[PDB]
mmCIF file of C-alpha atoms and ligand atoms in Angstrom:
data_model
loop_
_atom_site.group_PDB
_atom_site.id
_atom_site.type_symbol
_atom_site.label_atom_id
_atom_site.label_comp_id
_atom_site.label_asym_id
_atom_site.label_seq_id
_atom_site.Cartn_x
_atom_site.Cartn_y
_atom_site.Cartn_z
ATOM 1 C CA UNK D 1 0.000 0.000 0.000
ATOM 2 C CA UNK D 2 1.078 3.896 -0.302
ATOM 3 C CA UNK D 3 3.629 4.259 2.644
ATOM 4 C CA UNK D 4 2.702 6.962 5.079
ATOM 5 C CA UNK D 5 5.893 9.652 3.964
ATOM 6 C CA UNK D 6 4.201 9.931 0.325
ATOM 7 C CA UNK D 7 1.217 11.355 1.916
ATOM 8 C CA UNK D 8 1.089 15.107 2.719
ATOM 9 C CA UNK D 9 -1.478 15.028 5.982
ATOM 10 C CA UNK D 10 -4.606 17.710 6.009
ATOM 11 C CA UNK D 11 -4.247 17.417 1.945
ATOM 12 C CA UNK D 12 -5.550 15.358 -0.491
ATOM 13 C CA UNK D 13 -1.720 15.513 -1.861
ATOM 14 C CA UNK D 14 0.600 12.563 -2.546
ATOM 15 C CA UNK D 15 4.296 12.535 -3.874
ATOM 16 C CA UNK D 16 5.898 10.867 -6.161
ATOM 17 C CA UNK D 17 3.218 8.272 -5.602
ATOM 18 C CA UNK D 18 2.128 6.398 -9.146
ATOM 19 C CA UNK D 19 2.624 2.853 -8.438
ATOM 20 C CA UNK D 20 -0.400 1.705 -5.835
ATOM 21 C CA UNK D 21 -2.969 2.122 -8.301
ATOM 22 C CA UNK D 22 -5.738 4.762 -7.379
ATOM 23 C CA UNK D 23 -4.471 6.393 -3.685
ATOM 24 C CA UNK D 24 -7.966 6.304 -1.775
ATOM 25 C CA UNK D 25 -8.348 9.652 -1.257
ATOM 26 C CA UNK D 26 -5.908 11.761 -3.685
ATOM 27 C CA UNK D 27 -7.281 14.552 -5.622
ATOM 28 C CA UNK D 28 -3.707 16.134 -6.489
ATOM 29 C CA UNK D 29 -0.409 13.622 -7.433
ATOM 30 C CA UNK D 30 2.749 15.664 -7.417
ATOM 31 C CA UNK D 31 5.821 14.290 -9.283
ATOM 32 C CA UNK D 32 9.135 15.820 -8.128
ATOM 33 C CA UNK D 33 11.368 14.605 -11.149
ATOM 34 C CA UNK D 34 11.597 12.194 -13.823
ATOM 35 C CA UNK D 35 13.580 9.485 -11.787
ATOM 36 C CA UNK D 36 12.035 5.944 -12.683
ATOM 37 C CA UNK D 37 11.905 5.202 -9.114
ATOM 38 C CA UNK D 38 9.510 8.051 -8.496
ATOM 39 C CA UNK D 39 7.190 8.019 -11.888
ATOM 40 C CA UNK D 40 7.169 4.473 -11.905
ATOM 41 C CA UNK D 41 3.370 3.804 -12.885
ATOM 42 C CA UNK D 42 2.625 6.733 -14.812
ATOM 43 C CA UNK D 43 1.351 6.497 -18.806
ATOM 44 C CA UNK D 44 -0.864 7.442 -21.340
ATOM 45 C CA UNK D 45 -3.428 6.344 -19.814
ATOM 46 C CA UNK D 46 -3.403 8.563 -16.218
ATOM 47 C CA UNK D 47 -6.512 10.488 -15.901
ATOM 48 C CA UNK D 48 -5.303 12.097 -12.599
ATOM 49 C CA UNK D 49 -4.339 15.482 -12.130
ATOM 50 C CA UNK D 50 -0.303 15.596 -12.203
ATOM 51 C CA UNK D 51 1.285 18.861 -10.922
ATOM 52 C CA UNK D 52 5.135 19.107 -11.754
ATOM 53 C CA UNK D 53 7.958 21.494 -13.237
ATOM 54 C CA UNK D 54 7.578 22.519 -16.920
ATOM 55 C CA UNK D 55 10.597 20.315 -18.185
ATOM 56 C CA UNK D 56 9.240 17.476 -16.129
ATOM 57 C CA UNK D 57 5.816 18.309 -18.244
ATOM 58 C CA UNK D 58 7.802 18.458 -21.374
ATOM 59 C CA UNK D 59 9.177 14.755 -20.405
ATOM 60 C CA UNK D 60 5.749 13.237 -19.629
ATOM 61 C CA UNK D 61 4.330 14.089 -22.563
ATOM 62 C CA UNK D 62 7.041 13.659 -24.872
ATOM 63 C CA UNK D 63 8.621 9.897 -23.380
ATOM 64 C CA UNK D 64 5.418 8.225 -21.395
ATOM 65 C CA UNK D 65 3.082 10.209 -23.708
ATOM 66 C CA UNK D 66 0.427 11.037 -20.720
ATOM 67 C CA UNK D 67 -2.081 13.202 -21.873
ATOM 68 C CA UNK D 68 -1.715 17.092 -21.994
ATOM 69 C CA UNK D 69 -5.188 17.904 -20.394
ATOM 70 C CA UNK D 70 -3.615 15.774 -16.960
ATOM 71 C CA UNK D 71 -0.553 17.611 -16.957
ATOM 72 C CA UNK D 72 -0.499 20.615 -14.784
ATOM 73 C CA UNK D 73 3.217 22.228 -14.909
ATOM 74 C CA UNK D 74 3.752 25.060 -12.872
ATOM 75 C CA UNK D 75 6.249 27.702 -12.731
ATOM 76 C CA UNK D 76 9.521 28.312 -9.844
ATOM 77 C CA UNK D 77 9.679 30.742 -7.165
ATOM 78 C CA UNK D 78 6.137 31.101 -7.234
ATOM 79 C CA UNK D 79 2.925 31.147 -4.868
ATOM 80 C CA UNK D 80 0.189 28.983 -6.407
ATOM 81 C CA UNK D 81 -3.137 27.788 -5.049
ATOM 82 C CA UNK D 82 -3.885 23.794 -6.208
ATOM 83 C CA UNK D 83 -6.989 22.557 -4.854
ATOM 84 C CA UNK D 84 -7.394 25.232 -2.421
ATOM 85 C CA UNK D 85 -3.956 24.641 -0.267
ATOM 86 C CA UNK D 86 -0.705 27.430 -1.478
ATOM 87 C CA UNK D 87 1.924 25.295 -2.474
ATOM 88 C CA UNK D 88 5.695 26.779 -4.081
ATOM 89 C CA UNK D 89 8.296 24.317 -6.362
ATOM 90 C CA UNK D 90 11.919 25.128 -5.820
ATOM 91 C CA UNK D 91 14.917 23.798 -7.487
ATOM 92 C CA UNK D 92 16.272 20.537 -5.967
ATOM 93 C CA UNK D 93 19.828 20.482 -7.670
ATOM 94 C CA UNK D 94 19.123 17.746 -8.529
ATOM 95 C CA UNK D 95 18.932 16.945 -12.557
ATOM 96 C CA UNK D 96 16.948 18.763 -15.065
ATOM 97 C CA UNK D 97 13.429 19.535 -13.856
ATOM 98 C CA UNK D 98 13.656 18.273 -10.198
ATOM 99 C CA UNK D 99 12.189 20.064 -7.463
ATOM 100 C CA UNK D 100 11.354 20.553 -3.754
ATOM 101 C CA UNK D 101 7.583 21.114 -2.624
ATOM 102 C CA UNK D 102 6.396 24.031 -0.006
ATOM 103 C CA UNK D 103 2.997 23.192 1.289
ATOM 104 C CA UNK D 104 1.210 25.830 3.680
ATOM 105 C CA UNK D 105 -1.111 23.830 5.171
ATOM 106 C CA UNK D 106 -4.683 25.688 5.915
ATOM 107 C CA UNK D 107 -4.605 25.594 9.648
ATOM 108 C CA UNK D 108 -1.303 26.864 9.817
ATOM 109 C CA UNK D 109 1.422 24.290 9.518
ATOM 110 C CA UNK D 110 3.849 24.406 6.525
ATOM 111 C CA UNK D 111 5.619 21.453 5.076
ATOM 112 C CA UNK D 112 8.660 20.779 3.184
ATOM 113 C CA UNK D 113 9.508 17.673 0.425
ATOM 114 C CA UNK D 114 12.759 17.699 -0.968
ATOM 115 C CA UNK D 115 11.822 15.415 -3.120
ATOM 116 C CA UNK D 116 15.174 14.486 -4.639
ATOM 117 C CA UNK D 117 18.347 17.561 -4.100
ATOM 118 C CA UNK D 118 21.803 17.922 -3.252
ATOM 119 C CA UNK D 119 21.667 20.600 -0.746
ATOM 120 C CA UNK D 120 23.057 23.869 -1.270
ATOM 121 C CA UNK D 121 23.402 26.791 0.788
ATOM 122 C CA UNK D 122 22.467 29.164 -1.964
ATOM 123 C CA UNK D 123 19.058 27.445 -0.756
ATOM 124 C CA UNK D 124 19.125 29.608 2.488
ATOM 125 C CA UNK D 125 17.976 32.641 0.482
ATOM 126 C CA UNK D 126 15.442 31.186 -1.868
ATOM 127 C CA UNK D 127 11.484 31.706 -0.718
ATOM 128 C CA UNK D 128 12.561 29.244 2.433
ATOM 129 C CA UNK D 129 13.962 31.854 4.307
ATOM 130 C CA UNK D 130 10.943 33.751 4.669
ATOM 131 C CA UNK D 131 9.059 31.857 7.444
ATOM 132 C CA UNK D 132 9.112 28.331 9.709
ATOM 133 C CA UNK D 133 8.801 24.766 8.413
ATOM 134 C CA UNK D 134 7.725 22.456 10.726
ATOM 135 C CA UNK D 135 7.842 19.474 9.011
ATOM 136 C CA UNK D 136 10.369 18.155 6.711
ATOM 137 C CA UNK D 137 10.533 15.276 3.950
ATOM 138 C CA UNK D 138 13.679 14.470 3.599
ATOM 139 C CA UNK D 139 15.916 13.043 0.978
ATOM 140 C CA UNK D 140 18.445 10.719 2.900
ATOM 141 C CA UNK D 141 20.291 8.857 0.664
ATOM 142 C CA UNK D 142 23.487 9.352 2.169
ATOM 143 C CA UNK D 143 22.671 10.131 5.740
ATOM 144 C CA UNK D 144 25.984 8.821 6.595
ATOM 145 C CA UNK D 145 29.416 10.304 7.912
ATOM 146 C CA UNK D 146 31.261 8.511 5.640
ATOM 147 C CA UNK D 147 29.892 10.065 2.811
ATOM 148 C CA UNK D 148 32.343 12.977 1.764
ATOM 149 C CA UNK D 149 32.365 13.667 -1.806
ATOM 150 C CA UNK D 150 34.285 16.697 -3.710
ATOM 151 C CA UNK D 151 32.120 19.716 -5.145
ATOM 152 C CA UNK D 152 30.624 19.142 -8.898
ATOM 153 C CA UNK D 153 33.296 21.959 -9.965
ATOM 154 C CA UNK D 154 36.003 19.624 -9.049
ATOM 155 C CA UNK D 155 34.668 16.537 -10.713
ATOM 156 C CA UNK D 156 34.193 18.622 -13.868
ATOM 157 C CA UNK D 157 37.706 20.033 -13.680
ATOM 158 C CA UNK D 158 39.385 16.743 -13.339
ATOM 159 C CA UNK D 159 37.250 15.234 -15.740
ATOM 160 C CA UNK D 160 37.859 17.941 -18.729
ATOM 161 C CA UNK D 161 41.592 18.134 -17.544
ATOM 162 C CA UNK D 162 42.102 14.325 -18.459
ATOM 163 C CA UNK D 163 39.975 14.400 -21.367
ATOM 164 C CA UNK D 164 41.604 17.044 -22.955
ATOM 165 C CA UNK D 165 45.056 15.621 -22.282
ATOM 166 C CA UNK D 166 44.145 12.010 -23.714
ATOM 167 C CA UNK D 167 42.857 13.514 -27.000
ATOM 168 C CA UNK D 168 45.642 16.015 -27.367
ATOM 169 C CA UNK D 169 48.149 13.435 -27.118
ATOM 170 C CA UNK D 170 46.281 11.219 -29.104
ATOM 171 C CA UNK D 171 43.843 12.512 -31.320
ATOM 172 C CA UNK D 172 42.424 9.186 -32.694
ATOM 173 C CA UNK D 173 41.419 8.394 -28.859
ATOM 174 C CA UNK D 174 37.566 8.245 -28.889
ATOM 175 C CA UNK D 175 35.727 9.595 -25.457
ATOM 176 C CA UNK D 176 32.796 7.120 -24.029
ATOM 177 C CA UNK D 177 30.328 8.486 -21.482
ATOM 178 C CA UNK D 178 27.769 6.268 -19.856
ATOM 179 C CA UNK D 179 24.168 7.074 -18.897
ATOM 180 C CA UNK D 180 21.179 5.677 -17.852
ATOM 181 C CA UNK D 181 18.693 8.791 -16.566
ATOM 182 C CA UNK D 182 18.446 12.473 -17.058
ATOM 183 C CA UNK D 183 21.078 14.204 -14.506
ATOM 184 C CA UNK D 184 24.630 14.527 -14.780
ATOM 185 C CA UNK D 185 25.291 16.429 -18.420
ATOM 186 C CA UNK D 186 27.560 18.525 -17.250
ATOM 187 C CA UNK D 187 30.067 15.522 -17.591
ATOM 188 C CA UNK D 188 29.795 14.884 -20.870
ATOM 189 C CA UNK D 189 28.501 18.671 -22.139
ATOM 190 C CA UNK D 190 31.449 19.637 -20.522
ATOM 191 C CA UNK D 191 34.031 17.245 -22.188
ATOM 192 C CA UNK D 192 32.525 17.873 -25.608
ATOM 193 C CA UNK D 193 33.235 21.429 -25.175
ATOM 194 C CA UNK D 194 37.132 21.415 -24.744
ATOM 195 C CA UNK D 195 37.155 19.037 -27.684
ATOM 196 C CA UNK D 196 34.996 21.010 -29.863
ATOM 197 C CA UNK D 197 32.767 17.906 -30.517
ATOM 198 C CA UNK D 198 28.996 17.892 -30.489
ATOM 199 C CA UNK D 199 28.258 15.083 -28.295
ATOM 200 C CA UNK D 200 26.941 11.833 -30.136
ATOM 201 C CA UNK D 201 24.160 9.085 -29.117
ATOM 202 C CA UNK D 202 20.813 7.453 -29.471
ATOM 203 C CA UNK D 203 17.589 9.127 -31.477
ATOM 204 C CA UNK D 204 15.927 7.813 -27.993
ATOM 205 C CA UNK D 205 18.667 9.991 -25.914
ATOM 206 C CA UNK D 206 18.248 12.767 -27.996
ATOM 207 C CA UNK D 207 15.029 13.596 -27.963
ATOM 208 C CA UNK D 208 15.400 13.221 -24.242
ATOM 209 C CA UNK D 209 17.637 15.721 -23.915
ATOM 210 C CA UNK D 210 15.626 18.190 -26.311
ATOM 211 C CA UNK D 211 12.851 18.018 -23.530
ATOM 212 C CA UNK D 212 15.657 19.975 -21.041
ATOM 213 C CA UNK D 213 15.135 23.687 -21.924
ATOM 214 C CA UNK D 214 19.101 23.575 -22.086
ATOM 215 C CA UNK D 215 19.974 26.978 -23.738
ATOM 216 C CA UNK D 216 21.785 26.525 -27.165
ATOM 217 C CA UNK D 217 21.382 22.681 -27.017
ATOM 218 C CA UNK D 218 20.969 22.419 -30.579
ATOM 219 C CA UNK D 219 24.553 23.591 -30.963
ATOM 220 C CA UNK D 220 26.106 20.699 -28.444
ATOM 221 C CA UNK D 221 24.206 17.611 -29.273
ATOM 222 C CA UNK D 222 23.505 15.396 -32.503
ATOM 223 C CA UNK D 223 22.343 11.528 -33.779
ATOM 224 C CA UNK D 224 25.391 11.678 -35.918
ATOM 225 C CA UNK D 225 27.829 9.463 -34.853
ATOM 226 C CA UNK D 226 30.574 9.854 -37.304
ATOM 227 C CA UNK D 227 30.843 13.548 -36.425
ATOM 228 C CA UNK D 228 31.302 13.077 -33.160
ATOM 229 C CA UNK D 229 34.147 12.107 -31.119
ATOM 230 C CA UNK D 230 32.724 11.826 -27.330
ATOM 231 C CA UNK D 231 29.807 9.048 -27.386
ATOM 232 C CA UNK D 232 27.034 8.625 -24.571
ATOM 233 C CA UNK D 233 26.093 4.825 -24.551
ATOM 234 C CA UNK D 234 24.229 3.202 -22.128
ATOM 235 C CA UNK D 235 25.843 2.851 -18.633
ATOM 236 C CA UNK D 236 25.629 -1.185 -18.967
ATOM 237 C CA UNK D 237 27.816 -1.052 -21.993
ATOM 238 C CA UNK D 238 31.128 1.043 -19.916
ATOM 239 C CA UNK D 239 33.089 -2.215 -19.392
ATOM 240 C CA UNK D 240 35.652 -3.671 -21.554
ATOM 241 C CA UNK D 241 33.445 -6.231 -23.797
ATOM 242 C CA UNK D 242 30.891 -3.401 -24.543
ATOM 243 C CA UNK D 243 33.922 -1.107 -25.312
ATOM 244 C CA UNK D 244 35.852 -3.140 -27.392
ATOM 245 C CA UNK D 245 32.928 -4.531 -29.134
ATOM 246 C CA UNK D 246 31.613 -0.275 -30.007
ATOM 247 C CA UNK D 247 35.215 0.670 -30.861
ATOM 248 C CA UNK D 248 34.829 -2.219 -33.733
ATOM 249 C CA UNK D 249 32.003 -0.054 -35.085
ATOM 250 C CA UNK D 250 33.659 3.203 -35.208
ATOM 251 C CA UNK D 251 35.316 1.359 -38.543
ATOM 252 C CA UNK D 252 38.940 1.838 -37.752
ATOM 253 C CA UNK D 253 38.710 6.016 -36.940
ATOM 254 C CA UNK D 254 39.518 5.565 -33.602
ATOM 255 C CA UNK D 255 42.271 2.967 -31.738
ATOM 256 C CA UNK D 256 41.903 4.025 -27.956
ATOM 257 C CA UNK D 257 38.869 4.589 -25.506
ATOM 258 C CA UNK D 258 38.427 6.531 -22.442
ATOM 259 C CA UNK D 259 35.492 6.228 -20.942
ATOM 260 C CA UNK D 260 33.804 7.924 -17.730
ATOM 261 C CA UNK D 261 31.324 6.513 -15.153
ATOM 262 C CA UNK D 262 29.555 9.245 -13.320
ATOM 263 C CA UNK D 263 28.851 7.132 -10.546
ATOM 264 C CA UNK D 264 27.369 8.556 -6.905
ATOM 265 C CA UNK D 265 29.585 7.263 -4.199
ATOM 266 C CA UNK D 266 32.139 4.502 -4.285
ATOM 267 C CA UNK D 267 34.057 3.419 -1.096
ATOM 268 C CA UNK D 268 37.512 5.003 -2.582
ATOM 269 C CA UNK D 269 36.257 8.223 -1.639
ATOM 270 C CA UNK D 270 37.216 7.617 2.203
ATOM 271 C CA UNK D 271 40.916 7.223 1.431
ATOM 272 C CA UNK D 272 41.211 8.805 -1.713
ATOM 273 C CA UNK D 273 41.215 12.388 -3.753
ATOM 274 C CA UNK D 274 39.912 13.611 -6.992
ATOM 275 C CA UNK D 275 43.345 14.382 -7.961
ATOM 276 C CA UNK D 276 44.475 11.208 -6.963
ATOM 277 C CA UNK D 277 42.017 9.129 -9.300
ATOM 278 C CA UNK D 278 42.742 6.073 -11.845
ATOM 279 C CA UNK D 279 41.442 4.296 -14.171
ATOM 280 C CA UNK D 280 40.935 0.505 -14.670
ATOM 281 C CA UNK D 281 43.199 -0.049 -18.187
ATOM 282 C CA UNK D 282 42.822 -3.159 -20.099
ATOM 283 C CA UNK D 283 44.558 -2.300 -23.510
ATOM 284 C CA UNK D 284 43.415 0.279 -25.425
ATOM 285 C CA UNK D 285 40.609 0.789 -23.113
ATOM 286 C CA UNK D 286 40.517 3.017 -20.002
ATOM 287 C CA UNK D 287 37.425 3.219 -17.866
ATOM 288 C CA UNK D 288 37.295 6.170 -14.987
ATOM 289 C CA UNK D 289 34.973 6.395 -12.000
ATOM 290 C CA UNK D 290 34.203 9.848 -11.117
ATOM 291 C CA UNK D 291 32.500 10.767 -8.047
ATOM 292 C CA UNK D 292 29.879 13.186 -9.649
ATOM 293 C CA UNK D 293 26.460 13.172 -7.176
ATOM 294 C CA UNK D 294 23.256 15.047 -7.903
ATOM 295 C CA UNK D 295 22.412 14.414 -3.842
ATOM 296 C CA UNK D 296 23.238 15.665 -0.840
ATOM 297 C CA UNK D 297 26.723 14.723 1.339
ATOM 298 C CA UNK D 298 26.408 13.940 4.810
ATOM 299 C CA UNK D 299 27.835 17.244 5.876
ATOM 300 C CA UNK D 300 25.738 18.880 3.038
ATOM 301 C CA UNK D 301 22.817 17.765 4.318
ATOM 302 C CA UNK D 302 23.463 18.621 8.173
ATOM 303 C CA UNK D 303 24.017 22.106 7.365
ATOM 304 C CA UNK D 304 20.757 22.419 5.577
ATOM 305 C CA UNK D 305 18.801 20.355 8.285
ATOM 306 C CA UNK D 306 20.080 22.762 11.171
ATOM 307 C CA UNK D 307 19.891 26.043 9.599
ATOM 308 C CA UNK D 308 16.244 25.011 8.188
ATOM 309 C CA UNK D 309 15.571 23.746 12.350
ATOM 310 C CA UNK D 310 12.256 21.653 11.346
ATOM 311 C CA UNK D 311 9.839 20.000 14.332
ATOM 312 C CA UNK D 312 9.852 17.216 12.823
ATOM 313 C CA UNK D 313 12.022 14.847 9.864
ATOM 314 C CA UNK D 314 10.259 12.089 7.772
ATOM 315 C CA UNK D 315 13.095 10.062 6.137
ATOM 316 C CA UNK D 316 11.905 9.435 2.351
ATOM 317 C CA UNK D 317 15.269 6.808 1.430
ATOM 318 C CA UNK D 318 16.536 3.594 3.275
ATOM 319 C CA UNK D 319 13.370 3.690 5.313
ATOM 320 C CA UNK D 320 12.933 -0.391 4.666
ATOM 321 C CA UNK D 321 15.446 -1.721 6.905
ATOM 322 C CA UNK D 322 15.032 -1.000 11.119
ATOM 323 C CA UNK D 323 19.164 -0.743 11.720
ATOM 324 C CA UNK D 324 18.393 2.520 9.048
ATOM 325 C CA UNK D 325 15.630 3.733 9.833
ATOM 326 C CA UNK D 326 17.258 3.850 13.904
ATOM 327 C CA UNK D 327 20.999 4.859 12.433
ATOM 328 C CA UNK D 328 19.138 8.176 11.211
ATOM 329 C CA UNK D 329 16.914 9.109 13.522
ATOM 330 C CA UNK D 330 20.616 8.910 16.271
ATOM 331 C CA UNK D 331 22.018 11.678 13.546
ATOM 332 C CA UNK D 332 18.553 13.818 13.771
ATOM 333 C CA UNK D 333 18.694 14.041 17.460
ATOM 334 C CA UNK D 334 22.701 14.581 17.613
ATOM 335 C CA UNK D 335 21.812 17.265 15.424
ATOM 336 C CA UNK D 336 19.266 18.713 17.275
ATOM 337 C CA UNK D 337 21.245 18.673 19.773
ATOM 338 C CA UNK D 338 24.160 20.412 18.675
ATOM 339 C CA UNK D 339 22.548 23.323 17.182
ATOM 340 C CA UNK D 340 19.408 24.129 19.771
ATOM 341 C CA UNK D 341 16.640 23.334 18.536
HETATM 342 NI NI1 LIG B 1 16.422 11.031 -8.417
#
């Protein structure tokens, strides 16, 4: 049945909630992204109102083809009345349409759902500072202390650094990037800049991509292969059969590969640095893990828990397991805690 932290209480709202058939009792369905995890259940044939960002509309009806009269974007920054309740959408930084939810709830209470987001404190001036939340639902993915992981600006550094080296020494090396969601095309938009490549991949991919509101994306993306020299394949193919077996393909233009995994966090990122990364090398092929997250570190996350000082946290990730759910709720009160409230 729907689990009790996809409901928003004194609403008929629920979140990211589109796999339990019809929610006894939901006039409003809210998606925060287009994640799999979190649309899993919507399609063409919805007949529910869904509220959402506008690229997460463009996505809906363009890739699950729901209906246009059942989508419902709405604009950021923004005080809007659904259903008679003032709700606001706020960017997650997360990927490419994601947002957080502000409820204000009629008798007073006001609610926050991060949906997905990598904190930020550029968040501590949006429309959040501007009165209390009391209640917050709260992405804890890696509500940890072991996850560290180095700013995106890093990751992209390193990452266009040692692309731009490999292709300068060599310049019949071909770049692979691997993908399997929206999020994380600042990796590969990035690399493909320094090169002065478009970036090559699927019709499927692409017309992904052109649901993004990316400015100039026409200019940094094509379905021609040949052109291109940085590929995006699917993130099951970065290993050394898939790579060896696309490099036959390429018809003898290219005789090395390296290759990038954006993955979130791996357990080198205890003992080691972003400048001391390698790659896993197997001939021609080279295959690189970067540490490149679209959520929230441990220490991210604390600082935006105990500036925002809620009542009250409802975990929304590794809530299945009781040594979790306990493990956070001893970091909620040590934050507490520490801070005062
Ligand atoms: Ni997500």
């Amino acid at each position: 049945t729907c689990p009790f932290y996809k409901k928003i209480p004194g609403t008929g709202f629920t979140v990211d909630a589109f796999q339990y058939g019809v929610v006894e009792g939901c006039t409003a369905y809210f998606l925060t992204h287009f994640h799999s995890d979190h649309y899993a259940g919507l399609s063409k044939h919805f007949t529910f109102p869904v509220y959402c960002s506008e690229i997460t509309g463009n996505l809906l009806k363009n890739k699950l083809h729901v209906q246009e009269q059942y989508i419902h974007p709405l604009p950021l920054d923004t005080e809007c009345i659904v259903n008679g309740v003032k709700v606001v959408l706020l960017d997650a930084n997360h990927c490419p349409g994601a947002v957080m939810i502000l409820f204000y709830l009629p008798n007073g209470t006001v609610i926050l759902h991060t949906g997905d987001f990598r904190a930020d404190p550029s968040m501590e001036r949006s429309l959040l500072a501007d009165q209390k939340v009391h209640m917050l639902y709260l992405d804890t993915t890696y509500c940890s202390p072991e996850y560290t992981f180095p700013s995106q600006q890093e990751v992209i550094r390193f990452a266009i650094n040692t692309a731009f080296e490999a292709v300068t020494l060599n310049p019949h090396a071909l770049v692979v990037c691997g993908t399997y969601s929206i999020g994380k095309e600042k990796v590969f938009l990035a690399i493909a800049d320094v090169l002065g490549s478009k970036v090559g991949m699927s019709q499927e991919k692409y017309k992904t991509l052109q649901c993004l509101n990316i400015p100039e994306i026409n200019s940094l993306i094509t379905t021609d292969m040949c052109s291109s020299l940085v590929h995006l394949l699917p993130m099951m193919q970065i290993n050394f059969k898939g790579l060896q077996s696309h490099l036959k393909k390429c018809g003898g233009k290219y005789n090395q590969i390296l290759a990038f995994r954006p993955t979130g966090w791996t357990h080198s990122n205890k003992f080691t640095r972003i400048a001391d990364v390698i790659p896993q090398t197997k001939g021609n092929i080279s295959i690189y893990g970067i540490p490149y997250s679209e959520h929230s570190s441990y220490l991210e996350m604390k600082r935006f828990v105990q500036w925002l000082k809620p009542q009250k946290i409802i975990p929304t990730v590794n809530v299945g397991t009781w040594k979790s759910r306990s493990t956070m709720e001893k970091y909620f009160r040590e934050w507490k805690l520490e801070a005062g409230y």
